[PDB]
Design a protein around this ligand. Structure first.
Ligand SMILES: NC(=O)c1ccc[n+]([C@@H]2O[C@H](COP(=O)([O-])OP(=O)(O)OC[C@H]3O[C@@H](n4cnc5c(N)ncnc54)[C@H](OP(=O)(O)O)[C@@H]3O)[C@@H](O)[C@H]2O)c1
Ligand SMILES: N[C@@H](CCC(=O)O)C(=O)O
Length: 418
């Protein structure tokens, strides 16, 4: 009825585990986060009053290393959502082979009504509250929904103040500004990883992307950068983009820069000059070769699953395809890139930033791009090889790979004897 996120995550995990040989005790261990921390976050309001907010910090599993995850500042943020996202982050960092665990944070707050001073106070108070469970080798937060690198810098500064500079305080948190322990290529990380996965999928299917058409659903940061990177690196034709308000259709192709400027100047991509105006519900069914949903989740359902005509569906967003839609698309012979594999570039570049901070030596744009390319190509090819060996779904193969890595790490530590 309410479809609790944690219940759905556990159901997904059970579905995945039924496709592989895993002990019952390890599955029961994986069904529950290893540590959940709920703290009060008191800040001083600009009018002088004191308001108390609820903060979360869930560390699902740290068998493979320190936990990794973002912090969400959303008025509708709950503990269940944080737990489910930490569980998903575990598999996200496991599939792309990072020495990380699963983690997530969140504060129930509406940041649109907070001033800059109040936002800084909130970040510093959250750090002061969760200092006891975070660290460069314990738990590394990251930017997420309604959180930017500015909050990352404030949080790192507060952590460094509390820690008294006894170690790599830069590495306690990622996504920071370039002036303070930042990393090159952070802004376009997720889209770059998605482009690498799309290129590898095209390589697997034997189709060249030069001159092909791509439709991107959702024109935020991820969607815009995905369309732009596809057009430049992959040589594809950006035929259709969209946002919440509406969508754009143009057979001759769309210039992502022009569309972004129009959206910035009018608040939406609606009524772009010399272009057909459509919505998402027909955008998802346009005849394309690559479809990249980069917007609100659950856009492909059994209603529209049979009408999808894309050869490759790159799930840039977090879970935009329902399991029934997954089965329908697999029946049609459409290669799907799993949600927590396609957008694994952001966490990979976050790991690169953490490595740079820990080592004290910082890389260049080309080095980061090449390392990200290697990691994403290897992860995608491992997932596709499992998908070809086990004759299962692509999402199922990615789950098998991630859960197998986590289970092996748990067995090596002696946490589970079977
Ligand atoms: C921070 C995470 O990175 P992110 O870039 O993925 O988040 P993001 O920057 O918030 O991206 C959100 C994008 O998806 C769009 N969107 C939100 N709800 C939608 C809906 N129901 N239907 C169609 N498009 C929708 C947004 O459009 P709008 O910004 O125009 O609402 C925006 O284009
Ligand atoms: N939460 C973001 C940040 C990456 C990270 O966890 O380091 C993501 O999953 O992409």
């Amino acid at each position: 009825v309410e479809i609790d996120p944690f219940e759905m995550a556990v159901k997904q995990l059970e579905r995945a585990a039924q496709y592989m040989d895993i002990s019952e005790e390890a599955l029961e261990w994986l069904k529950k986060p290893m540590r959940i921390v709920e703290v009060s976050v008191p800040i001083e309001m600009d009018d002088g009053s004191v308001k108390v907010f609820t903060g979360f910090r869930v560390q699902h599993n740290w068998a493979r290393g320190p936990t990794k995850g973002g912090i969400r500042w959303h008025p509708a943020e709950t503990l269940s959502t944080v737990k489910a996202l930490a569980t998903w982050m575990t598999w996200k960092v496991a599939v792309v082979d990072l020495p990380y665990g699963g983690g997530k944070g969140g504060i129930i707050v509406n940041p649109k009504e907070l001033s800059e001073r109040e936002q800084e106070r909130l970040a510093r108070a959250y750090i002061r509250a969760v200092y006891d469970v975070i660290g460069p080798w314990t738990d590394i937060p990251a930017p997420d929904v309604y959180t930017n690198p500015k909050i990352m810098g404030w949080m790192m500064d507060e952590y460094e103040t509390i820690m008294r500079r006894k170690g790599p305080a830069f590495g306690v948190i990622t996504g920071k500004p370039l002036s303070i322990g930042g990393s090159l290529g952070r802004g376009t990380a997720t889209a770059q990883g998605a482009i690498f996965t799309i290129r590898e999928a095209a390589k697997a299917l034997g189709i060249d992307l030069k001159g092909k058409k791509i439709a991107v659903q959702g024109y935020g940061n991820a969607g815009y950068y995905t369309a732009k990177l596809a057009k430049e690196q992959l040589g594809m034709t950006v035929v259709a983009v969209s946002d919440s308000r509406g969508g754009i259709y143009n057979p001759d192709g769309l210039d992502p820069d022009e569309v972004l400027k129009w959206k910035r100047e009018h608040g939406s991509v609606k009524d772009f000059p010399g272009a057909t105006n459509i919505t998402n519900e027909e955008l998802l069914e346009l005849e394309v070769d690559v479809l990249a949903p980069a917007a609100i989740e659950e856009v492909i359902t059994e209603k529209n699953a049979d009408n999808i005509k894309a050869k490759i569906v790159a799930e840039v967003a977090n879970g935009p395809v329902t399991p029934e839609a997954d089965d329908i698309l697999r029946e049609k012979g459409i290669l799907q890139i799993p949600d927590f594999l396609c957008n694994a570039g952001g966490v990979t570049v976050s790991y690169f930033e953490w490595v740079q901070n820990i080592n004290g030596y910082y890389w260049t744009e080309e080095e980061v791009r090449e390392k990200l390319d290697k990691k994403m190509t290897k992860a995608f090819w491992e997932v596709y090889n499992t998908h070809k060996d086990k004759n299962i779904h692509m999402r199922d193969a990615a789950y098998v790979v991630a859960v197998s890595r986590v289970y092996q790490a748990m067995k090596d530590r002696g946490w589970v004897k079977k």
